[PDB]
Design a protein around this ligand. Structure first.
Ligand SMILES: O=P(O)(O)OC[C@H]1O[C@H](OP(=O)(O)OP(=O)(O)O)[C@H](O)[C@@H]1O
Ligand SMILES: O=P(O)(O)OC[C@H]1O[C@H](OP(=O)(O)OP(=O)(O)O)[C@H](O)[C@@H]1O
Ligand SMILES: O=C(O)c1cccnc1
Ligand SMILES: O=C(O)c1cccnc1
Lengths: 467, 468
């Protein structure tokens, strides 16, 4: 089905004719360039290696298919049929490429090499950057995992300040983004990246991806709870919202249940329906099976604060040991509308200023978590840094006059820890001097084989917060 | 293999227990809610979803068991509706008892109108309508790409018509550079295909196969490209040999158009000294069908384009076209592919016009701005239940949140009509049945596991044309 010969940017089809004659090696690297988001979670390359790059990826039929498409697409014969046939005949269609990468889950400051790519056969000098397009899509799981982890840092800071511990942190940011991403494939990739940091998800696609490509000791990497949507409330008719609420919390009386409460009037629902008519069905619930009230409209901070004020007047509020107000354990709130890293910060800060514990609230995020992200957020970039031409290696780079931020690194690269425990990327082959301890890049792919793999449990450990 | 039982939001697994008892019908609809203002949307992409995910035998015993096993662990509880899915398998050989009606693909519809509706065709499957919300709502993405691409085409058409008097070349003026900048291979194909509704130039090869498989064109392919350099093929020569790289590349591609990225070290030197002097003899000899296309790729986009054009206008023979705008010789063009989105595209063409440069001189490449920097909230894409039957009684249902009237949803059975003035209106509460507005513009496109109406990519392009 998938054809790697048709999985590149069109212009790359023409690059084999553009490199210097007598070029035997093209060596390229990926970084999140330096320019907020000072460090990045490296995640997602193992998916790409296994799904698209390993094994026999070239066949006679795929070559003919590409040749025919490109003849029409370019209105010209430019496709390197010879070079692809070489890989087919010499290597049984396995890519003569070596990729070295930092371990998945590692948290690396901006401006460092995260992986490198080079050809292992001199005839395939053109192949290194053929697969740039595929490999650069690693920007997306890196950026989802990174932005999710930055939200975890905010939640952890405010949970610690308002409650004194981090209990429940892993469930405080729930993935609501399945319908809000651009494809089924993106849903799985993005949901898996969020699960590097959290355990709550409604994007089921992430589970199958992690099981197939990474693996966990536990049966599943992420969990959900029963929850209403507007259709299951509004189907009862507007005059029967109370009947809908009563039915749903009674069907799910012994597990947590989230009930969207803003179909008609969130404030009436909290004060009169939950707070009076159905109060007897709430105060009876277990600490392990709270009602979770879900507003879903209005200004996010103003709505959360007004919902909490209403609930604190109808239910017995305590003051925890840090001085912050706490709803009874059978009652919680989830804000799932308009949540991104900026509004999450605004809400928890507003709660803190009004003396509400972050224990009371959880968040759901859809587009903000999985779709409202681009390759430019972390300046994810893949560039050639080293070539061998006429048997001599030369260090190559770009350095555009009008934008020093786009200057790329020179020569053969390696990643090291510094004496102070930070990270440094050495350029120009200087890692070979061995002044800086071991290279942290490891070979993960060579000549069609995935050579080093990480479980999802290892990745989660590598991506832990300091605290 | 894809499993539609595992292709929904988790909470929807629990919804069959939440609807009113004795509900036999759930009817839902999709709109781009009323809130560049994006007043009209190109409806595109549902036919892909119908064919790839929803048609045919989508339920098997193995898929039911897989979903059962996953949800038991995911919920730590048995809530999965195994019986309901087995009914579909047994009664319909795994085909979905669903009817979907939709506006024709490529149609350009104002915001706030019904675009498609979904309802179950078997009373036992009242829960199925909104199970497939998640899948179907992903149509927001091709809709939004196609719409935003068409809005950029409107800008380009306006300024090309002003500065040149015609629209020659318009379909090649916005090239898709977004393959590496989207979130997956599947997204690349969907989004590139949506851009090809409006344009013919693309480097996102994945779009071609999607169109061939799911829509079809009379022509062999729906989009085209030209040879072009990247920084690796220039810089690999060494900083002191940029001229050698340029000479090699334009000589290799002497009789087709060739784009050459010229900013590796100093775009202004490259234009004035390398192209403008050292290699000028290799440029002024080229065919009108095979221009050199100089590609800056850094700096302030408008300032860089204007300075590149000023340099080239001093080194090459510029003419004045019939509208009074400056025009480079036909063997020389420029493409700006850095930092392009609908806002900077507008700023560049307006700044060119103010400096008396024809838009004939320029084309644009766009990656993330075209295919990735878009969300479901740009057009307020939304799927909502508007009608149910419970105890044999149909009721019109809706949401109307007190703090956001923009989220009010439509009531009852819906239909899309032409007004007497030729505009569009969505009739609510079954009022289309009164036939005061002629016939419903929605067509049944899916019924009981079968695609029942479909559109070629050529028809979609025709429907999506600009008025001009
Ligand atoms: O973070 P987001 O990308 O916005 O996703 C989260 C939203 O999505 C759901 O609503 P729904 O599908 O109704 O969205 P809508 O009201 O905009 O149509 C859900 O109830 C949240 O409000
Ligand atoms: O519109 P965009 O999403 O930005 O994609 C277009 C950019 O992508 C390419 O550069 P490259 O891969 O170098 O991007 P980079 O400079 O960030 O590395 C290309 O030369 C354009 O500059
Ligand atoms: O579980 C939820 O409340 C949910 C999941 C996805 C989208 N909106 C809400
Ligand atoms: O053809 C090009 O110039 C191109 C294609 C994709 C990305 N960047 C540039």
């Amino acid at each position: 089905e998938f054809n790697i010969l048709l999985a590149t940017d069109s212009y790359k089809v023409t690059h084999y004719k553009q490199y210097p004659p007598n070029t035997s090696k093209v060596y390229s690297y990926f970084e999140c360039r330096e320019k907020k988001y000072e460090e990045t979670v490296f995640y997602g390359l193992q998916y790409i290696l296994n799904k698209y790059l390993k094994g026999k990826v070239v066949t006679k039929e795929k070559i003919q298919e590409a040749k025919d498409v490109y003849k029409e697409h370019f209105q010209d014969d430019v496709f390197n049929e010879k070079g692809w046939n070489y890989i087919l005949e010499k290597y049984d269609g396995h890519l003569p490429i070596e990729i070295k990468a930092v371990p998945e889950g590692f948290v690396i400051p901006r401006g460092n090499v995260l992986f490198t790519v080079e050809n292992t056969d001199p005839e395939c000098y053109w192949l290194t950057n053929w697969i740039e397009t595929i490999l650069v899509q690693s920007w997306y799981p890196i950026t989802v995992a990174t932005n999710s982890r930055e939200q975890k840092k905010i939640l952890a800071k405010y949970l610690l300040e308002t409650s004194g511990n981090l209990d429940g942190l892993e469930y405080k940011l729930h993935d609501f983004g399945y319908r809000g991403v651009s494809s089924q494939e993106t849903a799985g990739i993005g949901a898996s990246a969020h699960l590097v940091n959290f355990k709550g998800t409604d994007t089921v696609a992430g589970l199958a991806l992690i099981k197939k490509y990474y693996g966990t000791k536990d049966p599943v990497p992420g969990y959900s709870v029963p929850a209403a949507e507007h259709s299951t409330i509004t189907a009862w008719g507007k005059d029967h919202e109370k009947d809908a609420f009563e039915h749903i919390v009674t069907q799910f009386s012994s597990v947590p249940v989230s009930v969207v409460s803003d179909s008609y009037d969130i404030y009436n629902a909290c004060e009169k329906i939950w707070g009076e008519d159905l109060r007897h069905l709430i105060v009876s619930r277990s600490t392990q099976a709270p009602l979770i009230i879900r507003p879903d409209s209005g200004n996010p901070l103003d709505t959360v604060l007004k919902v909490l004020e209403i609930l604190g007047k109808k239910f017995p509020v305590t003051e925890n040991s840090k001085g912050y107000k706490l709803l009874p354990p059978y009652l919680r709130v989830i804000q799932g509308d308009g949540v991104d890293i900026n509004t999450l910060q605004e809400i928890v800060e507003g709660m803190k200023q009004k003396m509400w514990s972050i224990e009371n609230i959880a968040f759901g995020s859809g587009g903000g978590l999985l779709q409202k992200l681009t390759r430019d957020l972390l300046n994810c970039s893949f560039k050639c840094s080293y070539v061998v031409t006429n048997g001599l290696g030369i260090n190559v780079f770009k350095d555009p006059v009008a934008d020093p931020n786009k200057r790329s690194k020179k020569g053969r690269l390696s990643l090291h820890r510094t004496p102070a425990g930070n990270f440094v990327t050495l350029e120009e082959g200087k890692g070979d001097l061995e002044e800086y301890g071991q290279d942290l890049l490891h070979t993960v792919f060579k000549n069609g084989k995935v050579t080093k793999s990480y479980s999802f449990d290892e990745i989660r450990k590598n991506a832990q917060l300091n605290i």
